């Protein structure tokens, strides 16, 4: 999408099941990983509630000490929620976990606020949330849409602030 050619299937204006126009939603690695983790843990909780109906521990999964412990919790979650029949989901989740720029929800919200305060395109915002660039020109070349649309000083400020926001591992 160098020229923002998203096609009909991925138009900026989306028609939902309610028939009202909505802005197209784009999520980076951190947002998508958090959303899928939340959905999986909610589904696990629903499954446990259903099993209790037919017939505490969940706080430790979301709060992970380390990357390896997070990966182990992810494997347990996939075993207990997915069944192990979906390898592509495991690969995507591993790719999200290994290269997640931001682990905490509040920091991800800060990144979202910083990127979308200027009102840029959701594609550019998600790309900036996915890519960490040292210099504004590096991002502008690697994101041709950002060219001619954002001042270099603003892009440099955003990139430096994002680099500062990265939580040390």
């Amino acid at each position: 999408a160098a020229t923002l050619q998203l096609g009909q299937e991925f138009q900026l204006k989306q028609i939902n099941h309610q028939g009202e126009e909505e802005e197209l939603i784009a999520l980076n690695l951190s947002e998508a990983r958090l959303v899928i983790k939340e959905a999986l843990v909610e589904r696990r909780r629903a499954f446990k509630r259903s099993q209790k109906k037919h017939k505490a521990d969940d706080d430790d999964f979301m709060h992970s000490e380390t990357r390896e412990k997070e990966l182990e919790s992810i494997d347990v979650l996939l075993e207990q929620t997915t069944g192990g029949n979906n390898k592509d989901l495991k690969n995507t989740m591993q790719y999200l976990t290994n290269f997640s720029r931001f682990r905490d929800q509040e920091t991800v919200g800060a990144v979202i606020q910083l990127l979308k305060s200027t009102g840029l395109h959701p594609f550019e915002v998600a790309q900036l949330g996915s890519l960490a660039c040292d210099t504004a020109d590096e991002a502008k070349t690697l994101i041709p849409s950002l060219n001619n649309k954002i001042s270099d000083d603003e892009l440099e400020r955003i990139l430096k602030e994002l680099s500062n926001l990265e939580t040390l591992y």
């Binding site: 999408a1 299937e9 998508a32 899928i36 959905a39 069944g83 998600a126 020109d137």
Partner: protein, 171 residues
């Protein structure tokens, strides 16, 4: 690229499952068939939202075999790139013709003609890699690839990208 879309599917339920618990069987069928799939019209099917809010439609018994077909609509998060897209990814394998980069669930290949000559192939290194004056790219190295084209089949989408211009390689 991650996006939220509205999807629909036609699911056939066997006559032997015709009981009061049909909604549970439909939900299990949907979850077991849709999640993790790939469709060339919408890319890989990554996840489905609002599992409790699954929309259903009245059955329509087929006149030939008795299996009841249902139309199910939902909202899903999916991944699909576009021409000219630039994405960060992880090097998978190193070859003399170029390299392969995993981005999300997909693979983008770059041929040696698509990088500047400053990056030279080193085979004696363990593992073999591409070495330049500033950037070194190898396994588990974050590399930015500008995707140029994509080929879509029933179950997967392959991609071919180029890094011939500046500000590409190791980050």
């Amino acid at each position: 690229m991650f996006f939220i879309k509205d999807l629909s599917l036609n699911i056939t339920l066997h006559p032997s499952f015709f009981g009061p618990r049909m909604k549970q069987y439909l939900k299990t069928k949907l979850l077991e068939e849709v999640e993790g799939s790939c469709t060339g019209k919408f890319g890989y099917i990554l996840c489905v939202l609002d599992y409790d809010n699954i929309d259903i439609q009245r059955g329509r018994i087929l006149p030939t075999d008795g299996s009841a077909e249902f139309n199910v609509k939902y909202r899903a998060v999916v991944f699909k790139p576009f021409k000219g897209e630039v994405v960060d990814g992880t090097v998978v394998s190193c070859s003399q013709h170029g390299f392969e980069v995993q981005v999300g669930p997909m693979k983008v290949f770059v041929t040696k003609h698509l990088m500047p000559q400053d990056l030279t192939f080193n085979a004696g290194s363990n593992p073999p890699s591409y070495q330049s004056s500033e950037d070194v790219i190898t396994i588990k190295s974050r590399i930015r690839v500008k995707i140029e084209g994509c080929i879509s089949q029933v179950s997967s989408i392959h991609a071919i990208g180029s890094i011939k211009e500046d500000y590409l390689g190791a980050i």
